[PDB]
Design a protein around this ligand. Sequence first.
Ligand SMILES: *OP(=O)(O)OCC(C)(C)[C@@H](O)C(=O)NCCC(=O)NCCSC(=O)/C=C/C
Lengths: 163, 48
Amino acid sequence: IADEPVKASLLLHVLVAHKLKKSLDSIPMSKTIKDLVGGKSTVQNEILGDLGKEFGTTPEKPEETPLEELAETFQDTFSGALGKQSSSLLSRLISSKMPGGFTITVARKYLQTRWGLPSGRQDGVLLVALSNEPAARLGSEADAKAFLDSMAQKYASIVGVDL
Amino acid sequence: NLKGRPYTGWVDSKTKEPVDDKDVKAKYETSILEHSGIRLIEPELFNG
Ligand SMILES: *OP(=O)(O)OCC(C)(C)[C@@H](O)C(=O)NCCC(=O)NCCSC(=O)/C=C/C
């Protein structure tokens, strides 16, 4: 289908949600990183370190800027690329929670064949998969395919795509 | 901000592309002289 590059507002919202260990819905974009974190500066400074490694250059004081103004300031320079911090997050999601033999490229082939989603959508489906990483490894291949299918519909809901 | 970098100055009003004052004359003077002064009536300016 249509290949639109992944939005920075979704990427940023996933990285914060993954770090705070909360569901993507539990973090409102209106709240600031300093408000969200609840006084735990070490968590807040690890978030600012993840954002600095992901995008590169960051605004003056990103902990007091709400996640909207921070998302659009990143988007002005954001080339659309996966990132380095997201490379490691997705590498360790696939290595630690997917069945033995089921690598990242086999999931990239499956979602392409099943949904007709290009590499720009498949990035987004893998990012929304990261924000709600399952506690235990999915032993069966069909449970990993049912998770990836459920994540596609959740990504499709968030963006507004009809399959 | 304009294409990432911080810019201060004139830009083309259509394309938002930066325009240096030196370049304004080579880039626009022909269009300025064409659409100024005594000239054929332009329907867009007089309600078609
Ligand atoms: O948000 P937090 O992780 O709670 O940040 C810790 C905080 C700096 C607020 C403070 O409570 C703390 O850690 N106090 C213990 C003493 C300490 O770490 N002192 C050195 C801090 S850096 C400094 O002095 C720099 C000056 C330019």
